[PDB]
Amino acid sequence: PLHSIISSTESVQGSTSKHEFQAETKKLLDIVARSLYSEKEVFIRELISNASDALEKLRHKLVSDGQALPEMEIHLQTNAEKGTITIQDTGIGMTQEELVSNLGTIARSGSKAFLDALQNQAEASSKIIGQFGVGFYSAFMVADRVEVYSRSAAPGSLGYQWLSDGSGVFEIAEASGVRTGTKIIIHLKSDCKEFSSEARVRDVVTKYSNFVSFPLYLNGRRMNTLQAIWMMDPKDVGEWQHEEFYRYVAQAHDKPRYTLHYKTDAPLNIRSIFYVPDMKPSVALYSRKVLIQTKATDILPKWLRFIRGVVDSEDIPLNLSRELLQESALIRKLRDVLQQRLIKFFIDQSKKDAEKYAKFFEDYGLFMREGIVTATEQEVKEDIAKLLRYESSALPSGQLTSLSEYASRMRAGTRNIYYLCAPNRHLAEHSPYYEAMKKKDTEVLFCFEQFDELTLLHLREFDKKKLISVETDIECLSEKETEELMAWMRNVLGSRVTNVKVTLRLDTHPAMVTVLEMGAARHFLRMQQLAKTQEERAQLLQPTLEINPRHALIKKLNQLRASEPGLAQLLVDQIYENAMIAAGLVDDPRAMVGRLNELLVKALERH
Amino acid sequence: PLHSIISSTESVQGSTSKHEFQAETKKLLDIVARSLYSEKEVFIRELISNASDALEKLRHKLVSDGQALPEMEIHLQTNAEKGTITIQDTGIGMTQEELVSNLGTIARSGSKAFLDALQNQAEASSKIIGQFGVGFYSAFMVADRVEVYSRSAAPGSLGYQWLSDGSGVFEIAEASGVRTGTKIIIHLKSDCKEFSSEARVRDVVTKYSNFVSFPLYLNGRRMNTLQAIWMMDPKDVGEWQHEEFYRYVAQAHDKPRYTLHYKTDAPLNIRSIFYVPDMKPSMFDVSRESVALYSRKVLIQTKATDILPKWLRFIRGVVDSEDIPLNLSRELLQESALIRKLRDVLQQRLIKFFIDQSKKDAEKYAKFFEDYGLFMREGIVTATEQEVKEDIAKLLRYESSALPSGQLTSLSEYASRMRAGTRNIYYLCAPNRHLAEHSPYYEAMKKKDTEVLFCFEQFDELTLLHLREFDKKKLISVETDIVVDCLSEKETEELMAWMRNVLGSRVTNVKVTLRLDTHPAMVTVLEMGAARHFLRMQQQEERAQLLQPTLEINPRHALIKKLNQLRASEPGLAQLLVDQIYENAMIAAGLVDDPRAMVGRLNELLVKALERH
Numbered sequence A: 001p002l003h004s005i006i007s008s009t010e011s012v013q014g015s016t017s018k019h020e021f022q023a024e025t026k027k028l029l030d031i032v033a034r035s036l037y038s039e040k041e042v043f044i045r046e047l048i049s050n051a052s053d054a055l056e057k058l059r060h061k062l063v064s065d066g067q068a069l070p071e072m073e074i075h076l077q078t079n080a081e082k083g084t085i086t087i088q089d090t091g092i093g094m095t096q097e098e099l100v101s102n103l104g105t106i107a108r109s110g111s112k113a114f115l116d117a118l119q120n121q122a123e124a125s126s127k128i129i130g131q132f133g134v135g136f137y138s139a140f141m142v143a144d145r146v147e148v149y150s151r152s153a154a155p156g157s158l159g160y161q162w163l164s165d166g167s168g169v170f171e172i173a174e175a176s177g178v179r180t181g182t183k184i185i186i187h188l189k190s191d192c193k194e195f196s197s198e199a200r201v202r203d204v205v206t207k208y209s210n211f212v213s214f215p216l217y218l219n220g221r222r223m224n225t226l227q228a229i230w231m232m233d234p235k236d237v238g239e240w241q242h243e244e245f246y247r248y249v250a251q252a253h254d255k256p257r258y259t260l261h262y263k264t265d266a267p268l269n270i271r272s273i274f275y276v277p278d279m280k281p282s283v284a285l286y287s288r289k290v291l292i293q294t295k296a297t298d299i300l301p302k303w304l305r306f307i308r309g310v311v312d313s314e315d316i317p318l319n320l321s322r323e324l325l326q327e328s329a330l331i332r333k334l335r336d337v338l339q340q341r342l343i344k345f346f347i348d349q350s351k352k353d354a355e356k357y358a359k360f361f362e363d364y365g366l367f368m369r370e371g372i373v374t375a376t377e378q379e380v381k382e383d384i385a386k387l388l389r390y391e392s393s394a395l396p397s398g399q400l401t402s403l404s405e406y407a408s409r410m411r412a413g414t415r416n417i418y419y420l421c422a423p424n425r426h427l428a429e430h431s432p433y434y435e436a437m438k439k440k441d442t443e444v445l446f447c448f449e450q451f452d453e454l455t456l457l458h459l460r461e462f463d464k465k466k467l468i469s470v471e472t473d474i475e476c477l478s479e480k481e482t483e484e485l486m487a488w489m490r491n492v493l494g495s496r497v498t499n500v501k502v503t504l505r506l507d508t509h510p511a512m513v514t515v516l517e518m519g520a521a522r523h524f525l526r527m528q529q530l531a532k533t534q535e536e537r538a539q540l541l542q543p544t545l546e547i548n549p550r551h552a553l554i555k556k557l558n559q560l561r562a563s564e565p566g567l568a569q570l571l572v573d574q575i576y577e578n579a580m581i582a583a584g585l586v587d588d589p590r591a592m593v594g595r596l597n598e599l600l601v602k603a604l605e606r607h
Numbered sequence B: 001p002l003h004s005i006i007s008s009t010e011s012v013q014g015s016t017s018k019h020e021f022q023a024e025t026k027k028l029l030d031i032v033a034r035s036l037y038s039e040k041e042v043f044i045r046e047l048i049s050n051a052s053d054a055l056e057k058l059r060h061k062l063v064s065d066g067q068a069l070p071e072m073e074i075h076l077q078t079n080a081e082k083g084t085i086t087i088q089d090t091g092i093g094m095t096q097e098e099l100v101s102n103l104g105t106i107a108r109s110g111s112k113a114f115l116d117a118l119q120n121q122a123e124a125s126s127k128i129i130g131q132f133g134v135g136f137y138s139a140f141m142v143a144d145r146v147e148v149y150s151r152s153a154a155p156g157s158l159g160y161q162w163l164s165d166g167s168g169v170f171e172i173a174e175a176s177g178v179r180t181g182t183k184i185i186i187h188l189k190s191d192c193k194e195f196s197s198e199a200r201v202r203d204v205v206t207k208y209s210n211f212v213s214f215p216l217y218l219n220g221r222r223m224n225t226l227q228a229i230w231m232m233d234p235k236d237v238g239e240w241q242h243e244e245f246y247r248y249v250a251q252a253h254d255k256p257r258y259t260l261h262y263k264t265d266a267p268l269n270i271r272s273i274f275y276v277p278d279m280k281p282s283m284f285d286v287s288r289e290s291v292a293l294y295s296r297k298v299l300i301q302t303k304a305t306d307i308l309p310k311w312l313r314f315i316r317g318v319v320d321s322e323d324i325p326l327n328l329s330r331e332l333l334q335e336s337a338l339i340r341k342l343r344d345v346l347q348q349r350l351i352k353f354f355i356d357q358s359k360k361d362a363e364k365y366a367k368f369f370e371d372y373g374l375f376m377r378e379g380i381v382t383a384t385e386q387e388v389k390e391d392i393a394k395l396l397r398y399e400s401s402a403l404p405s406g407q408l409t410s411l412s413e414y415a416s417r418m419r420a421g422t423r424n425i426y427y428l429c430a431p432n433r434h435l436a437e438h439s440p441y442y443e444a445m446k447k448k449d450t451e452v453l454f455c456f457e458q459f460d461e462l463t464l465l466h467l468r469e470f471d472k473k474k475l476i477s478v479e480t481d482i483v484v485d486c487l488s489e490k491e492t493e494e495l496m497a498w499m500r501n502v503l504g505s506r507v508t509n510v511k512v513t514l515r516l517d518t519h520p521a522m523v524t525v526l527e528m529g530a531a532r533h534f535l536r537m538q539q540q541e542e543r544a545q546l547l548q549p550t551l552e553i554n555p556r557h558a559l560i561k562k563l564n565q566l567r568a569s570e571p572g573l574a575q576l577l578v579d580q581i582y583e584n585a586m587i588a589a590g591l592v593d594d595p596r597a598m599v600g601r602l603n604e605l606l607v608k609a610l611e612r613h
C-alpha cells in the first residue's frame, strides 16, 4: 500500500552565510565544445551571426550620429594548404576592456546590453541575433587555437591581439596594423580538417547564413542572392520570385499551386510564407533571418507537413544550442494560430476557385483525413472537416460539395448527416441501403477515397449534427421468356450470383452487378493483391447480377441457350465479368482475358 | 568582380598579458532556467537522476568496506495546497564544503570526481547519470525558492541548510533534525503550478523515470512496475516477461511475434531489444509519419530524426546505450558522427536477425513477410546506398515456376540453383501464380528454360527496378527480356501494315512473334517497370504519345488467322475486334487505367458479332 517517511522534523539552528554562486570556466569550455551543440559545423554559423550583429550595431551607431555609411561586409576566407578558416567583418569593433568583458567572460553578451540601451525596439532590435553570449566559444570544438584581430571604430581606437586554445585560459595582447572591425583566425583541429574545403563552407552558408542582411563574401565572391522575400510586403513581391524561393527551401523543381503570405502578428511577430507543392505524394524554421531547423515538426501540425516554406519570428524563445524551445508555453499557441490561418486560407481558395481546390483536394486528401483522426480537441476536427469534399446523391457526379454547404440545403427537421462509403458512385447509387434513403427526398454523402470511413467515424459530429452511416440504420423481352432466363442463369452462376432480377434503368449496358455488403465490398477490392482466386471470391462477396431485357445481349441469349448450349455458358460468364469491371469491383480485368480470348474465336466461326 | 579584403597586414606589437576566462553567474542561471531545456517537466527527472547517482555512490562506498548495506529508497512528495514538491533520497549526502563546491559552483558535480576516483571504471561507471553539473539548476525553471537539506553519510556528519531563489546568491546554514540523505524542497512558481498535482508528477515520471535502479515512491506509492529487462542475460528474461515490457513501449495490447535482445560491446556499449508486433500493421498507421532511446536508464525523448531506419519503423522497443554523447539539454546530438554508426549497426543486426528467423521458422516468417513486407520494399526503393539494397533484398520472398505453390524462396537461394551461364535474374509480376502461368509473357518465355520469380504484393515490381542488382546478377523482367531479344508471309504482311493504319493513334510499331502459342497478341515496352508505375500512382492520346506500346501478334493464334477473312468480308467490324485485341494485350501488360469504356466497346462489339444466330 502506502509507505512514506516524509516528515518536517528538520529545523534551522545554524548561522546563514551570504556568498555568490561560483562560476569558473574549466568545465564550461568543455561543455560548450563537447555537449552544447548537436552538430559540429554550427560554429561558423555562430561567427557569421556575431559578424552580422556587429555590422548592425555599427550601422545603428552611424545612423544615430548622422554621418556617412562606409562599406560593411562579412568576408570568409579558407586556406586549404594552411588548413585554416578566416572570418572578418567591419563592425563596431572591440577595445581592450570590451574584449576582456565579452570574450573573456562566459555568457556575457554585449549584444544584450546594446539592446537594453536602445529603448525603441523598432530600429535595429529585431536584427540583433546574439542573445546568449556563448556563440563564439562554439569554435573551440574544431580549433586548437583561435586568433582574433579586433579594433573599435572609434576615431582613435587601436587594435588588440586575442589568443586562446580552449583550455579555459586566454592570452590577450596588442596588435598593430589591424583595420577597423574584427578578424578571426581559426586553426582547424586534426579531426576537423573537413572544414578546410570551400565547398563545405559554401554549403554551410547556403544552409544557414543564406539570408544575412549584409553581403557575405567567401574567398571574394558574393552568393546570397536572397534578400528575405518573406520580410517585405506580400503585394510588393511578385509571383515570379515565389517559385524560385519555393524551389530553394523545398529542394524541389516544381511550382507552388498556392501561396499564403501570413504577416499578421497577434501572438508573435510572425513573418511566414507557405507553399503547396504541385507534385502530389517540412517547413524550415527561421529566427532573425537565421535558420533554426529544416524540419520543424513542432510549429506546424503533422497533417500540415505537406506544405513548404519558412516561418520566421523575431521573438520566439530559442534554446542554448540555437534550436526551437519545443512545446513551450507560447509555442503551442503558434501552432493553433498557424493551423487556423492555413485552414481559413484553404477555405477561401475553394470559394475563389472551386475547380482548382478540387484538384488540390484529390491530391492532398489523405493529409486532411489524417488530421481529423489524429486530432485531440473536438473543435479542431470541425475546422479540418470544412476542408473535406464529397459528392452527394442529389447533385450530378463530377462535382464535389463541402460538408458546410451540405447543411445549407439540409432541412430544419433533419438533424443527422447521412454518409455512405462505397468504392465508386455506381455501387452507391444502386445499393438497397441508399434506395431506402432514396425513397425520401433526403440526400446522402458518398465517400470514395480510402480511409474515409475511419475519418467519418472519428469526426463523429459536424455543425452540432451527429454523424451516422446508412449501413447502421437498415424493344423489350416478353415476361414469360425472361422468367426462365434467370432460372438457367442461377445454375451457371450459382456460386457467384445470388439472384437475378429485372432492371429498367440500363440505356446501353446489358447488365450491372450490385452488392448489399459495401463494407465487405472493400474487402473484395482489397483482395485484389492477395488470394483473388475465382473459386474463392464468389463465396466471400456473393453479389447479385441485374440485367435488362432491352439490350441485344440479353435478347440474344434466348436462342443461344438452346441452339448453342456450349457458347451460352461461356457468354454468360463473360457478361458477368463485364458487369464487375463496369461497377469497379475488380481493379484490373486481367482474369477475364483468358476466357474472352477463347470466346471470340468461336463467336465468329461462320464468318 | 572577385574582390576580397582578407590580408595579412596585421602583426603583433605589444606584449601578452596574463588573463583567465570568467563567467557571468546571473546570465548563466537565467539561460539554464529559461533557454536550456525545451520541457519544463524535466527538472524532476534531473533530480531523480541525481538521487539515483547519490544512491549508487552510497552503495559503492558501503560495499567497498564490505559492511552491511542499508535500504535504498527514493521519495517524490507533492503538496497541492502548499504548491510545493518534496524530493528526498538516501544518498551519500553533502557536507558544507561539498555543498559549496558542487551546488555553489556551476557545471561541476561530484559524479565526475566519483567516476575518476573509481580507478577501475567497471563497478559503478555504468550507473552514473550526472555528467554536466547543471542538472540541479533545472529546478529554477519552475521554482522561485529552492530549499535543500543534506548531510553526508560519514560517521559523525551534521545536517545543513541550502536556500536559493535563483538570483545568483544562495545562503547556507546548519540544520538540525536532518537524517541521512538529501531532501529538496521546491516552491513552485505562480504560473508553473501545474506540477503541484499528483497526475502531472506521475505522468512525467512514467515518461522519464520508469526504470530507475532504485525504488521510487509517489506519495508512498510505488510506481515503477518495471526492472529494465534489457540489461541482464537474454536467457534470464522469460518469454512472458517480454510481453509485459512490450505492452508499455508499444502502447498496444497485443503480443510481440519476434524478440531480438541485442547486447554487443565491440562497436559500442549497446543493450537494445526490439519487438515485432504480431498484428497486421494498419494501412492508415503506415501512411502516417518508433524506438525509445535510453541512456543510464534515463529517457532522451529523441524519437524524431529517425535514429532507426525508416523502413524499420514497424518494430517497437528500446535502444540503451551509455557511451553516446548528449548535449546540455540531455538530448541526443542530432546528425552526430557516432550516432550514424548506431543506425548502421542496428540495421545490420536487424537484417541478420530476420534472416535467422526465416531459416529457423520458414512458415512463421512467411506470415511476417505477408504483413510487414511493404516496409522492406519501401526501404530498398528509398535506400541511398547500393550495398544496403542487397542486404534488405535477402528479406524478400518470392515463389518460382519450378517449385509448386505454397512455398516461398528468397533471392539468395534463387541464384544457388540458377544457371551460372547468364548474369540475369528473371522476375514476372502478376496478381496470381495461376494468372502468371497463363500470362502471355510466360508463354513467350517458355522458349528458354530458366526459373522465373513471381511478384504478387503491391510495389513489388518497383522494388526490383530500384534494387537493379543482386549478388552481381542483373534483374531483368520477363517483359524486358522479350523486347530486347499457320499464316504465310504474304497474307500476314498486308494485315500487319493494315493494323498500324487503325492503331497508329495507339501503338507505334507492330512485329511478328513466333513464341506466343495461346495468346492472340501481346505488347512490349522498352522500360515496362517505369511505365506500369507511371500509370498506376501518378497517372488515350495524352498517354499513347509517351508510352510507345510495341504491340505484337501471334500468327499461330486463331484470332489472328480469323482477321485475314474478317478484314475482307466486312471491313466495318474488323477494326472493332482489332481494338479489342489491342485492349486485351494492354490489360495483360497491366497498363490499363480506365476500364470504364472498355466494357462499353466490348459489349457493343458483341452486338453485331453474332447477331445472326
Ligand SMILES: Nc1ncnc2c1ncn2[C@@H]1O[C@H](COP(=O)(O)OP(=O)(O)O)[C@@H](O)[C@H]1O
Pocket: A046, A049, A050, A051, A053, A054, A089, A091, A092, A093, A094, A102, A103, A108, A109, A110, A111, A112, A129, A130, A131, A132, A133, A134, A135, A136, A137, A181, A182, A183
Ligand atoms: N566579429 C565581431 N565583431 C565585434 N564583436 C563581436 C564579434 N564577434 C563577437 N563579438 C562580441 O562578442 C560577444 C559574445 O558573442 P558570442 O559569445 O559569440 O555570443 P553572442 O553573439 O550571443 O553574444 C558579443 O557581445 C559580441 O558583441
Ligand SMILES: Nc1ncnc2c1ncn2[C@@H]1O[C@H](COP(=O)(O)OP(=O)(O)O)[C@@H](O)[C@H]1O
Pocket: B046, B047, B050, B051, B054, B089, B091, B092, B093, B094, B102, B103, B108, B109, B110, B111, B129, B130, B131, B132, B133, B134, B135, B136, B137, B181, B182
Ligand atoms: N538528491 C541529491 N542527493 C545527493 N547529492 C545531490 C543530489 N542532487 C544533487 N546532488 C549533488 O549536486 C551535484 C551537482 O548536481 P547537478 O547540478 O544535478 O549536476 P549532475 O547531474 O551532473 O550531478 C552532484 O555532484 C551531486 O552530488
Ligand code: BEF
Pocket: A046, A049, A129, A130, A131, A132, A133, A134, A135, A136, A320
Ligand atoms: F551567439 Be550566442 F549563442 F547567443
Ligand code: BEF
Pocket: B046, B049, B109, B129, B130, B131, B132, B133, B134, B135, B136
Ligand atoms: F544532470 Be547534470 F546536467 F549532469
Ligand SMILES: [K+]
Pocket: A102, A103, A104, A105, A106, A107, A108, A109, A133, A134, A136
Ligand atoms: K562571450
Ligand SMILES: [K+]
Pocket: B102, B103, B104, B105, B106, B107, B108, B109, B133, B134, B135, B136
Ligand atoms: K552543480
Ligand SMILES: [Mg+2]
Pocket: A046, A049, A050, A129, A130, A131, A133, A135, A136
Ligand atoms: Mg552570437
Ligand SMILES: [Mg+2]
Pocket: B046, B047, B049, B050, B130, B134, B135, B136
Ligand atoms: Mg543533475
